Amino acid sequence: XPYXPKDLX
């Protein structure tokens, strides 16, 4: 997604 860790996105 718009902000977070690599595998969240």
XYZ file of C-alpha atoms in Angstrom:
9
model
C 0.000 0.000 0.000
C 0.885 3.713 0.536
C 3.033 3.177 3.690
C 4.425 0.189 5.530
C 6.958 -2.664 5.543
C 8.065 -4.400 2.371
C 5.482 -7.300 2.388
C 2.625 -5.077 3.623
C 2.676 -2.341 0.959
